[PDB]
PDB file of C-alpha atoms in Angstrom:
ATOM      1  CA  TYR A   1       0.044   0.000   0.043  1.00 42.46           C
ATOM      2  CA  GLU A   2       1.369   3.368  -1.072  1.00 43.18           C
ATOM      3  CA  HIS A   3       1.058   6.266   1.369  1.00 38.74           C
ATOM      4  CA  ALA A   4       2.867   9.600   1.439  1.00 37.23           C
ATOM      5  CA  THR A   5       3.116  12.446   3.930  1.00 38.76           C
ATOM      6  CA  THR A   6       5.415  15.402   4.215  1.00 38.69           C
ATOM      7  CA  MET A   7       7.727  15.455   7.073  1.00 38.56           C
ATOM      8  CA  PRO A   8       9.021  18.823   8.486  1.00 36.59           C
ATOM      9  CA  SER A   9      12.934  18.804   8.168  1.00 35.87           C
ATOM     10  CA  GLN A  10      13.578  19.773  11.803  1.00 37.21           C
ATOM     11  CA  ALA A  11      16.264  17.984  13.743  1.00 35.43           C
ATOM     12  CA  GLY A  12      15.197  16.476  17.114  1.00 34.55           C
ATOM     13  CA  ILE A  13      11.533  16.766  16.551  1.00 36.98           C
ATOM     14  CA  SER A  14       9.450  13.839  15.935  1.00 35.95           C
ATOM     15  CA  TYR A  15       6.542  13.242  13.625  1.00 36.16           C
ATOM     16  CA  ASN A  16       3.556  10.782  13.767  1.00 34.78           C
ATOM     17  CA  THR A  17       0.857   9.538  11.611  1.00 34.30           C
ATOM     18  CA  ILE A  18      -1.764   6.795  11.415  1.00 31.76           C
ATOM     19  CA  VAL A  19      -2.570   4.815   8.328  1.00 35.30           C
ATOM     20  CA  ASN A  20      -6.072   3.389   8.176  1.00 34.09           C
ATOM     21  CA  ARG A  21      -8.590   1.829   5.936  1.00 36.49           C
ATOM     22  CA  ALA A  22     -12.293   1.014   6.089  1.00 37.82           C
ATOM     23  CA  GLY A  23     -11.612  -2.663   7.292  1.00 39.42           C
ATOM     24  CA  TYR A  24      -8.108  -2.469   8.847  1.00 39.38           C
ATOM     25  CA  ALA A  25      -7.011  -1.273  12.165  1.00 39.40           C
ATOM     26  CA  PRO A  26      -5.052   1.877  12.623  1.00 36.25           C
ATOM     27  CA  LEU A  27      -1.223   1.177  11.975  1.00 38.18           C
ATOM     28  CA  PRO A  28       0.793   3.833  13.582  1.00 38.28           C
ATOM     29  CA  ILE A  29       3.939   5.420  11.791  1.00 40.26           C
ATOM     30  CA  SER A  30       6.580   7.497  13.521  1.00 39.06           C
ATOM     31  CA  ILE A  31       9.713   9.229  12.210  1.00 43.48           C
ATOM     32  CA  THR A  32      12.365  11.161  14.040  1.00 45.81           C
ATOM     33  CA  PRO A  33      15.300  12.690  12.069  1.00 44.05           C
ATOM     34  CA  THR A  34      18.099  12.862  14.624  1.00 44.48           C
ATOM     35  CA  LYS A  35      20.475  14.608  12.257  1.00 45.74           C
ATOM     36  CA  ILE A  36      19.804  15.928   8.656  1.00 46.76           C
ATOM     37  CA  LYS A  37      23.094  16.266   6.744  1.00 42.95           C
ATOM     38  CA  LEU A  38      23.782  18.451   3.778  1.00 44.79           C
ATOM     39  CA  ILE A  39      26.890  17.280   1.863  1.00 49.29           C
ATOM     40  CA  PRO A  40      27.778  19.283  -1.220  1.00 50.13           C
ATOM     41  CA  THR A  41      29.658  17.867  -4.332  1.00 52.93           C
ATOM     42  CA  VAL A  42      33.120  19.461  -4.041  1.00 51.91           C
ATOM     43  CA  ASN A  43      36.366  19.281  -5.712  1.00 52.55           C
ATOM     44  CA  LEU A  44      39.708  20.912  -4.679  1.00 50.53           C
ATOM     45  CA  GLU A  45      41.074  23.768  -6.901  1.00 48.52           C
ATOM     46  CA  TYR A  46      44.215  24.328  -4.892  1.00 52.13           C
ATOM     47  CA  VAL A  47      45.907  24.833  -1.434  1.00 49.17           C
ATOM     48  CA  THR A  48      47.468  27.945  -0.229  1.00 48.97           C
ATOM     49  CA  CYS A  49      49.713  28.819   2.806  1.00 51.60           C
ATOM     50  CA  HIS A  50      52.377  31.268   3.955  1.00 50.55           C
ATOM     51  CA  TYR A  51      55.198  31.776   1.588  1.00 51.38           C
TER      52      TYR A  51
ATOM     53  CA  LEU B   1     -21.452  -4.314  12.165  1.00 49.31           C
ATOM     54  CA  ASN B   2     -18.412  -3.846  14.220  1.00 45.32           C
ATOM     55  CA  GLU B   3     -16.292  -4.227  11.042  1.00 50.34           C
ATOM     56  CA  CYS B   4     -17.014  -4.649   7.351  1.00 52.08           C
ATOM     57  CA  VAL B   5     -14.508  -5.256   4.544  1.00 51.50           C
ATOM     58  CA  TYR B   6     -16.290  -5.796   1.152  1.00 50.24           C
ATOM     59  CA  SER B   7     -14.242  -8.731  -0.052  1.00 49.16           C
ATOM     60  CA  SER B   8     -14.333 -12.071  -1.475  1.00 48.12           C
ATOM     61  CA  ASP B   9     -13.622 -13.739   1.825  1.00 49.17           C
ATOM     62  CA  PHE B  10     -15.503 -13.257   5.125  1.00 49.17           C
ATOM     63  CA  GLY B  11     -14.145  -9.842   5.760  1.00 48.94           C
ATOM     64  CA  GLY B  12     -17.397  -8.646   7.509  1.00 52.94           C
ATOM     65  CA  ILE B  13     -17.862  -8.968  11.309  1.00 51.73           C
ATOM     66  CA  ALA B  14     -21.123  -8.407  13.170  1.00 48.64           C
ATOM     67  CA  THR B  15     -21.900  -8.640  16.766  1.00 46.81           C
ATOM     68  CA  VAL B  16     -25.436  -9.583  17.940  1.00 43.46           C
ATOM     69  CA  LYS B  17     -26.489  -8.615  21.421  1.00 45.75           C
ATOM     70  CA  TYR B  18     -28.895 -11.272  22.662  1.00 42.72           C
ATOM     71  CA  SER B  19     -31.191 -11.829  25.662  1.00 40.79           C
ATOM     72  CA  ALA B  20     -31.924 -15.478  25.468  1.00 41.43           C
ATOM     73  CA  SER B  21     -34.597 -17.404  27.397  1.00 46.16           C
ATOM     74  CA  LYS B  22     -32.150 -20.390  28.060  1.00 44.05           C
ATOM     75  CA  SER B  23     -28.504 -20.938  27.239  1.00 46.13           C
ATOM     76  CA  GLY B  24     -27.465 -23.277  24.581  1.00 46.83           C
ATOM     77  CA  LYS B  25     -26.798 -23.476  20.841  1.00 45.64           C
ATOM     78  CA  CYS B  26     -28.859 -22.529  17.803  1.00 42.91           C
ATOM     79  CA  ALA B  27     -28.529 -21.594  14.160  1.00 43.82           C
ATOM     80  CA  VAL B  28     -28.052 -18.362  12.248  1.00 45.84           C
ATOM     81  CA  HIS B  29     -28.741 -17.375   8.610  1.00 44.43           C
ATOM     82  CA  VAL B  30     -29.431 -14.677   6.158  1.00 45.66           C
ATOM     83  CA  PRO B  31     -32.534 -15.124   4.106  1.00 45.92           C
ATOM     84  CA  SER B  32     -31.104 -13.096   1.253  1.00 40.87           C
ATOM     85  CA  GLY B  33     -28.130 -13.145  -1.160  1.00 40.98           C
ATOM     86  CA  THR B  34     -26.717  -9.943   0.273  1.00 39.35           C
ATOM     87  CA  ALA B  35     -24.567 -11.685   2.840  1.00 40.27           C
ATOM     88  CA  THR B  36     -23.196 -15.286   3.066  1.00 41.60           C
ATOM     89  CA  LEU B  37     -22.077 -16.325   6.536  1.00 41.94           C
ATOM     90  CA  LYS B  38     -19.068 -18.324   7.539  1.00 42.16           C
ATOM     91  CA  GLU B  39     -20.626 -20.050  10.523  1.00 43.07           C
ATOM     92  CA  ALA B  40     -23.931 -22.115  10.790  1.00 43.91           C
ATOM     93  CA  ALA B  41     -24.667 -21.963  14.412  1.00 45.77           C
ATOM     94  CA  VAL B  42     -23.713 -20.031  17.519  1.00 44.70           C
ATOM     95  CA  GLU B  43     -23.741 -20.729  21.346  1.00 42.79           C
ATOM     96  CA  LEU B  44     -25.632 -18.377  23.817  1.00 46.25           C
ATOM     97  CA  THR B  45     -25.503 -17.670  27.547  1.00 45.52           C
ATOM     98  CA  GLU B  46     -28.644 -15.999  28.847  1.00 43.80           C
ATOM     99  CA  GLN B  47     -27.952 -12.252  27.818  1.00 41.36           C
ATOM    100  CA  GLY B  48     -24.737 -11.385  26.106  1.00 40.37           C
ATOM    101  CA  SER B  49     -23.027 -11.083  22.701  1.00 36.32           C
ATOM    102  CA  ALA B  50     -22.116 -13.286  19.916  1.00 36.31           C
ATOM    103  CA  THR B  51     -19.937 -12.839  16.779  1.00 36.84           C
ATOM    104  CA  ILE B  52     -21.128 -13.603  13.025  1.00 34.73           C
ATOM    105  CA  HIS B  53     -18.597 -13.732  10.297  1.00 34.24           C
ATOM    106  CA  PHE B  54     -19.829 -12.971   6.754  1.00 36.38           C
ATOM    107  CA  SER B  55     -18.864 -11.957   3.190  1.00 37.98           C
ATOM    108  CA  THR B  56     -20.882  -9.278   1.364  1.00 35.06           C
ATOM    109  CA  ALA B  57     -21.541  -7.664  -1.884  1.00 32.13           C
ATOM    110  CA  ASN B  58     -23.436  -4.554  -0.990  1.00 32.92           C
ATOM    111  CA  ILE B  59     -21.316  -1.358  -0.408  1.00 32.71           C
ATOM    112  CA  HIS B  60     -24.149  -0.212   1.832  1.00 34.69           C
ATOM    113  CA  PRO B  61     -25.061  -3.475   3.335  1.00 36.59           C
ATOM    114  CA  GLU B  62     -28.417  -4.099   5.063  1.00 39.45           C
ATOM    115  CA  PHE B  63     -29.678  -7.667   5.854  1.00 40.40           C
ATOM    116  CA  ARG B  64     -32.024  -9.719   7.965  1.00 42.03           C
ATOM    117  CA  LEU B  65     -29.971 -11.945  10.132  1.00 43.90           C
ATOM    118  CA  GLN B  66     -32.257 -14.767  11.014  1.00 45.52           C
ATOM    119  CA  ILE B  67     -31.183 -16.292  14.475  1.00 44.25           C
ATOM    120  CA  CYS B  68     -32.879 -18.599  16.885  1.00 43.47           C
ATOM    121  CA  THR B  69     -36.583 -18.068  16.183  1.00 43.59           C
ATOM    122  CA  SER B  70     -36.174 -14.335  15.572  1.00 42.42           C
ATOM    123  CA  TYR B  71     -34.392 -11.982  13.153  1.00 45.38           C
ATOM    124  CA  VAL B  72     -32.449  -8.719  13.605  1.00 48.46           C
ATOM    125  CA  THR B  73     -32.199  -6.008  10.935  1.00 49.90           C
ATOM    126  CA  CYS B  74     -28.248  -5.750  10.601  1.00 43.74           C
ATOM    127  CA  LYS B  75     -27.234  -2.429   8.705  1.00 41.99           C
ATOM    128  CA  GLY B  76     -24.046  -0.426   8.147  1.00 40.11           C
ATOM    129  CA  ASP B  77     -21.629   1.048   5.688  1.00 41.58           C
ATOM    130  CA  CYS B  78     -18.660  -0.920   4.327  1.00 41.63           C
ATOM    131  CA  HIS B  79     -15.278  -0.291   2.937  1.00 44.13           C
ATOM    132  CA  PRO B  80     -13.272  -1.612   0.036  1.00 39.78           C
ATOM    133  CA  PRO B  81     -10.690  -4.416   0.448  1.00 39.78           C
ATOM    134  CA  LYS B  82      -7.035  -4.358   0.401  1.00 38.82           C
ATOM    135  CA  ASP B  83      -5.608  -6.347  -2.621  1.00 40.00           C
ATOM    136  CA  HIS B  84      -6.767  -6.124  -6.163  1.00 35.81           C
ATOM    137  CA  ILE B  85      -6.249  -9.821  -6.891  1.00 32.85           C
ATOM    138  CA  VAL B  86      -6.853 -12.770  -4.594  1.00 33.92           C
ATOM    139  CA  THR B  87      -6.084 -16.568  -4.653  1.00 33.48           C
ATOM    140  CA  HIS B  88      -9.447 -17.998  -3.977  1.00 33.49           C
ATOM    141  CA  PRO B  89     -13.015 -17.682  -5.571  1.00 30.81           C
ATOM    142  CA  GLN B  90     -15.921 -15.542  -4.510  1.00 29.69           C
ATOM    143  CA  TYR B  91     -17.930 -16.551  -1.303  1.00 29.51           C
ATOM    144  CA  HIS B  92     -20.593 -14.005  -1.522  1.00 27.02           C
ATOM    145  CA  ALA B  93     -23.553 -13.863  -4.057  1.00 21.52           C
ATOM    146  CA  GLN B  94     -23.166 -10.921  -6.430  1.00 26.29           C
ATOM    147  CA  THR B  95     -25.969  -8.500  -6.595  1.00 24.36           C
ATOM    148  CA  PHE B  96     -26.893  -5.427  -8.580  1.00 23.22           C
ATOM    149  CA  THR B  97     -26.996  -2.889  -5.845  1.00 23.86           C
ATOM    150  CA  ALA B  98     -23.635  -1.290  -5.121  1.00 26.29           C
ATOM    151  CA  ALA B  99     -24.835   2.467  -4.830  1.00 26.30           C
ATOM    152  CA  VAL B 100     -24.010   5.508  -2.715  1.00 28.38           C
TER     153      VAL B 100
END
């Protein structure tokens, strides 16, 4: 069964939902993002230092 | 109807609250093609509740459950099933009425 729900992208805060149907009991679903990471694609152009 | 799943199998559940004259056992049926019951007879203890399994065609089911020298008008709204395709044949008699 396909279900979809937006989850706010806040770190530490939980999110809950119930998936239900006319003849099936409520199935709880819980999400908790403990750390959302934003890694960029990066390459090194150079390195500089004191001369 | 404490639960109804319009499905090929006996996805429908109904509780009958009863006040019997004496405890024992006796039959249960539906004099109509709307619902087909899984079980033939149920046991009763003075006044209490009993469970009947059934499969149904109507989306808005309503049927006379005949039970133990009486009958009760069961009625409710029913929900679609889970899977598109099942691996067994129909148990409930098809009927024209599947309206709002």
